Amino acid sequence: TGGSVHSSPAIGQDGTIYVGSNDHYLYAINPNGKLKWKFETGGSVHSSPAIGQDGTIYVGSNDHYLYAINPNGKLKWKF
Amino acid sequence: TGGSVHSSPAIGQDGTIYVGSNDHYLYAINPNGKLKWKFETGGSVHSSPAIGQDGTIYVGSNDHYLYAINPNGKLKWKF
Amino acid sequence: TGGSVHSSPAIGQDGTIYVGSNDHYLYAINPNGKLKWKFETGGSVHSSPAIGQDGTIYVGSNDHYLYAINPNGKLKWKF
Amino acid sequence: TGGSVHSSPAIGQDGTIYVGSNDHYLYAINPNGKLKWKFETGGSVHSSPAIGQDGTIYVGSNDHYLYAINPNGKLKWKF
Ligand SMILES: [Zn+2]
Ligand SMILES: [Zn+2]
Ligand SMILES: [Zn+2]
Ligand SMILES: [Zn+2]
Ligand SMILES: [Zn+2]
Ligand SMILES: [Zn+2]
Ligand SMILES: [Zn+2]
Ligand SMILES: [Zn+2]
């Protein structure tokens, strides 16, 4: 990555490892080690992501925002 | 929100995203992005909430308190 | 409690809420709100407890120790 | 251990307790209390490990790295 990983990884149903980092990013990583995508946030992602029934990744950041991100990496919504 | 989200989101059985923030609040957010309710606490909510069989949300805060909150947003009890 | 709750609560199979606090303690709390027991540790319990198949509560502390605690509150072992 | 345990323990399917520590290590501990193995990292392991279907332990560290570790203790990959 590019920042310390204080976030705890969540594992998708397809096996994808979802984790945040204090480099302002959220990383989706395949089990083989290659990166699926990364979603840039406005602050350090200290929160551990959560996965719902639809596969949406819910993670908070140090920019007052709670990000909802689709499995493909596009932003669903943000609070 | 109004504060950095160091808390990790818990996802309800109905799909509701439960998360805390260091703005002293606990947020219940629908999957569509709209807010269900928020419960104000006496300190920054750094702990990640937990959900039991009855749907009660258990989360700790930086005010020495462990809050138990019903799914509708009213306080069950606090330790 | 007596200290800020940075630990995230784990919920037992009987419904018991297991959480730590930075007052050096680990708290087991019944869903009704009354306390089951508390196990004193040598440092602030910042880690979130985990529960295994036998009901043992595994939680780390800021005293270099990883505590294993039986459901009744007595120490199983510590690393 | 040799450092404060800010990481939250993950419990394997065989019962093994996987946890990190700020002594730069990741600890795999049998339920009897004896250590299975430890994997040294380049920074304090503040993240809580996660376990996938294959039993791989995914944990982040304060050295910008996301470690993937096989159940036997050898490194799968790292990001
Ligand atoms: Zn760094
Ligand atoms: Zn930053
Ligand atoms: Zn801020
Ligand atoms: Zn405050
Ligand atoms: Zn205090
Ligand atoms: Zn202390
Ligand atoms: Zn120390
Ligand atoms: Zn160090």
Short mmCIF file of C-alpha atoms and ligand atoms in Angstrom, two decimals, chain C residues 61-64, chain D residues 2-5 22, ligand 7:
data_model
loop_
_atom_site.label_atom_id
_atom_site.label_comp_id
_atom_site.label_asym_id
_atom_site.label_seq_id
_atom_site.Cartn_x
_atom_site.Cartn_y
_atom_site.Cartn_z
CA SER C 61 -4.50 -6.19 26.80
CA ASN C 62 -1.91 -3.41 27.00
CA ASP C 63 0.16 -5.53 29.42
CA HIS C 64 1.64 -7.69 26.61
CA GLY D 2 6.54 -8.95 23.84
CA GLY D 3 4.30 -6.03 22.97
CA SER D 4 0.92 -4.54 23.75
CA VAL D 5 -1.97 -6.37 22.08
CA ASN D 22 2.77 -4.11 18.59
ZN ZN E 7 4.13 -2.36 26.93
#
